[PDB]
Amino acid sequence: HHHHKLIGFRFASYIDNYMVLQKEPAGAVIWGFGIPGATVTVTLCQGQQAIMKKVTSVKAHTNTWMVVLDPMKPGGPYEVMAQQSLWSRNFTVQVHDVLFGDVWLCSGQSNMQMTVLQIFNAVRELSDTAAYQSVRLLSVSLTEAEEELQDLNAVDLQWSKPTKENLGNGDFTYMSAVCWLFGRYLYDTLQYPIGLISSCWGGTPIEAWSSERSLKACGVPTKGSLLSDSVSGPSQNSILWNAMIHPLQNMTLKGVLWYQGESNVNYNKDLYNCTFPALIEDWRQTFHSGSQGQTERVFPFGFVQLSSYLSTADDPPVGVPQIRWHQTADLGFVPNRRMPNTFMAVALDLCDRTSPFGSIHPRDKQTVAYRLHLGARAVAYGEKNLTFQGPLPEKIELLSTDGLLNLTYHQSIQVLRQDLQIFEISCCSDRQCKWLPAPMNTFTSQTLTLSIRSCRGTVAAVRYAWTPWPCEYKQCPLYHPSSALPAPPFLAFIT
Numbered sequence: 001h002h003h004h005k006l007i008g009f010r011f012a013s014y015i016d017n018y019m020v021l022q023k024e025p026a027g028a029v030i031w032g033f034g035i036p037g038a039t040v041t042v043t044l045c046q047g048q049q050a051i052m053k054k055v056t057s058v059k060a061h062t063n064t065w066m067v068v069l070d071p072m073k074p075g076g077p078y079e080v081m082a083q084q085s086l087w088s089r090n091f092t093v094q095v096h097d098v099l100f101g102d103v104w105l106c107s108g109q110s111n112m113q114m115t116v117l118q119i120f121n122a123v124r125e126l127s128d129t130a131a132y133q134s135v136r137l138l139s140v141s142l143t144e145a146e147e148e149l150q151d152l153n154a155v156d157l158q159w160s161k162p163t164k165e166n167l168g169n170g171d172f173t174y175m176s177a178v179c180w181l182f183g184r185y186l187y188d189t190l191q192y193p194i195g196l197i198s199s200c201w202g203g204t205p206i207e208a209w210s211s212e213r214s215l216k217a218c219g220v221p222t223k224g225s226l227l228s229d230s231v232s233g234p235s236q237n238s239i240l241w242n243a244m245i246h247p248l249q250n251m252t253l254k255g256v257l258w259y260q261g262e263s264n265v266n267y268n269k270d271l272y273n274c275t276f277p278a279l280i281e282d283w284r285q286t287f288h289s290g291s292q293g294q295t296e297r298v299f300p301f302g303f304v305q306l307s308s309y310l311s312t313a314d315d316p317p318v319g320v321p322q323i324r325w326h327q328t329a330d331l332g333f334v335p336n337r338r339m340p341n342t343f344m345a346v347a348l349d350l351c352d353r354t355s356p357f358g359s360i361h362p363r364d365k366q367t368v369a370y371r372l373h374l375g376a377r378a379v380a381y382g383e384k385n386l387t388f389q390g391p392l393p394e395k396i397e398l399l400s401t402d403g404l405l406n407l408t409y410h411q412s413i414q415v416l417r418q419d420l421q422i423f424e425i426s427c428c429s430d431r432q433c434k435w436l437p438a439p440m441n442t443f444t445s446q447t448l449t450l451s452i453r454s455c456r457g458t459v460a461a462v463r464y465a466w467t468p469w470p471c472e473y474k475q476c477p478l479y480h481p482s483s484a485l486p487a488p489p490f491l492a493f494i495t
């Protein structure tokens with residue numbers, strides 16, 4: 001039958017068998033729909049034994065109900081029951097195989113959407129599901145709406161233990177490789193249940209994923225900007241937020257994983273350094289409110305920095321590095337003052353020349369997940385003495401007489417090769433500035449000199465890796481030796 005027997009009493013869409021609810025010290029939120037005047041009793045059971053009971057009622061002209069569970073220790077399985085007591089009649093719904101752990105929401109565009117089927121060494125990564133059954137998966141369906149939705153419209157993959165079949169179901173459909181591998185490495189580390197919720201659509205600018213509030217705070221035009229071929233998907237303000245994120249606001253989370261930016265290369269580019277941090281803040285506010293304060297007011301938000309690829313032919317190439325910079329709030333590293341409790345994975349050395357899905361869809365999502373997982377371990381789980389940032393210049397000295405720029409990095413650096421063009425200097429001379437290459441010259445363990453001899457004026461600024469395609473696969477010029485992390489792109493001014 002198309003209908004169920006019981007219609008008026010059901011859990012909210014994010015609740016189902018085999019799901020994962022956020023662990024201690026937060027309380028799991030359980031909400032759903034019911035008949036007015038009913039009294040709802042949620043009972044958390046471990047087999048035959050009821051461990052926890054919460055009680056609420058469905059107010060007069062409302063049709064929803066919600067309780068907040070007590071904090072729980074990670075593990076399982078558990079069963080969640082809800083009973084609607086409506087005067088003389090009782091109705092119950094039950095979900096089983098429920099786990100408590102860390103809940104991570106994965107969002108972004110096509111590089112998040114890209115699934116385990118399409119990635120490097122796909123067969124092994126799809127078969128090695130045995131040890132990770134406590135990692136649970138849910139993929140949200142592509143739906144768009146012009147107003148915020150209370151519940152999800154549709155779900156492509158319901159809460160499931162990972163299998164070959166649902167990890168790699170078609171192309172750009174079931175379970176991101178990035179989220180899956182991030183959750184897999186996070187489980188390797190934490191050894192307790194992880195829940196991964198994939199809500200992403202390829203070709204989408206950040207405006208689509210932001211609420212009205214953050215967009216207003218950044219002065220995004222209400223009437224959408226003209227868009228290029230880089231914006232292949234839903235672009236209207238908040239259209240994907242309304243339907244694919246907002247329904248989850250009342251759920252208790254560990255954090256968010258983000259892989260977006262490619263479509264903002266030529267859509268409201270110069271606003272990303274506002275809109276992306278705003279979005280983060282906004283979500284933190286909203287999800288904190290929606291979950292009755294259970295989701296941390298400043299929860300971990302980890303994102304991927306754009307990789308090396310070729311953008312579409314009607315975009316100015318410069319947009320790609322600019323977004324990479326805007327993704328850091330124009331500071332080059334995270335966490336920072338504008339983006340606290342955030343972690344980043346540098347991806348510009350993880351390109352793919354032979355990808356059958358386009359340079360923009362690199363097939364090495366494992367290294368991306370590994371670097372994201374370092375960031376998460378450090379920021380989300382406060383792991384100390386763990387390196388998760390690439391080397392960046394902490395001091396820049398100008399030796400004009402020698403024709404040199406001396407860059408002292410906060411980290412030890414490893415120089416693979418002497419690259420002549422990856423660094424650039426702004427030669428300014430009486431109201432005329434121009435960018436020129438600064439070849440790498442001589443280096444020590446923690447510092448590197450660039451040849452500014454080509455500049456006949458003053459050196460105002462220096463930038464590193466300001467290209468759409470700055471490096472070949474793991475053939476960037478600069479890495480931290482111990483951590484094997486690439487030096488991130490940067491723009492610094494000389495004062």
Ligand SMILES: *[C@@H]1O[C@H](CO)[C@@H](O[C@@H]2O[C@H](CO)[C@@H](O[C@@H]3O[C@H](CO[C@H]4O[C@H](CO)[C@@H](O)[C@H](O)[C@@H]4O)[C@@H](O)[C@H](O[C@H]4O[C@H](CO)[C@@H](O)[C@H](O)[C@@H]4O)[C@@H]3O)[C@H](O)[C@H]2NC(C)=O)[C@H](O)[C@H]1NC(C)=O
Pocket residue numbers: 270271273274329330
């Ligand atoms: C997010 O990122 C964007 C882009 O990277 C930043 O936008 C730039 O911000 C800077 C600083 O505010 C702007 O630089 C200023 O430009 C003024 C004139 O701009 C006109 O002309 C340029 C082209 O030359 C156009 O692109 C622009 O639209 C305007 O039509 C100058 O007059 C300014 O000089 C004055 O300020 C400096 C200090 O800031 C003083 O030292 C000077 O003496 C002088 O008083 C300055 O150069 C730049 O124009 C902005 N770009 C754009 C496209 O708007 C955002 O600032 C950044 N936001 C955040 C939050 O990080």
Ligand SMILES: *[C@@H]1O[C@H](CO[C@@H]2O[C@@H](C)[C@@H](O)[C@@H](O)[C@@H]2O)[C@@H](O[C@@H]2O[C@H](CO)[C@@H](O[C@@H]3O[C@H](CO)[C@@H](O)[C@H](O[C@H]4O[C@H](CO)[C@@H](O)[C@H](O)[C@@H]4O)[C@@H]3O)[C@H](O)[C@H]2NC(C)=O)[C@H](O)[C@H]1NC(C)=O
Pocket residue numbers: 041043083085087088089090
């Ligand atoms: C509809 O639902 C309501 C709500 O309570 C529900 O029943 C529980 C059994 C459990 O499932 C809850 O999770 C759930 O919310 C029912 O109303 C309750 O009905 C039960 C029926 O057993 C009553 O239980 C009795 O309560 C007495 C006062 O607390 C107590 O003295 C009784 O103990 C005696 O009987 C038991 C049963 O053999 C025995 O084991 C004892 O040792 C002792 O002899 C018994 O516990 C609840 O009190 C009721 N509570 C309320 C608030 O009404 C309702 O029965 C159910 N069905 C309908 C409406 O058709």
Ligand SMILES: *[C@@H]1O[C@H](CO)[C@@H](O[C@@H]2O[C@H](CO)[C@@H](O[C@@H]3O[C@H](CO)[C@@H](O)[C@H](O[C@H]4O[C@H](CO)[C@@H](O)[C@H](O)[C@@H]4O)[C@@H]3O)[C@H](O)[C@H]2NC(C)=O)[C@H](O)[C@H]1NC(C)=O
Pocket residue numbers: 031064065066150249250289290291
């Ligand atoms: C999920 O989280 C969201 C975000 O926190 C949460 O939204 C909140 O919903 C409640 C309704 O349950 C809103 O509070 C109401 O707002 C309306 C509009 O102003 C008022 O009219 C309401 O008053 C009614 O109830 C009063 C007594 O309770 C009566 O005295 C009165 O006459 C009305 O009948 C009430 O103030 C609240 O504003 C939002 N919060 C935000 C931030 O939007 C939602 O409820 C959560 N649960 C879900 C989605 O299931």
Ligand SMILES: *[C@@H]1O[C@H](CO)[C@@H](O[C@@H]2O[C@H](CO)[C@@H](O[C@@H]3O[C@H](CO)[C@@H](O)[C@H](O[C@H]4O[C@H](CO)[C@@H](O)[C@H](O)[C@@H]4O)[C@@H]3O)[C@H](O)[C@H]2NC(C)=O)[C@H](O)[C@H]1NC(C)=O
Pocket residue numbers: 397406407408442443444447448449
């Ligand atoms: C970028 O600039 C930094 C400036 O901080 C520079 O690092 C400095 O390099 C100089 C030269 O290598 C260092 O000076 C040396 O310091 C050691 C420390 O004990 C001394 O032993 C050295 O003395 C010997 O060499 C002298 C001539 O340089 C002789 O006069 C002397 O008798 C000894 O033979 C010397 O003083 C300086 O310590 C560092 N400073 C830091 C903080 O590292 C760096 O080299 C520049 N980058 C590049 C690529 O050149």
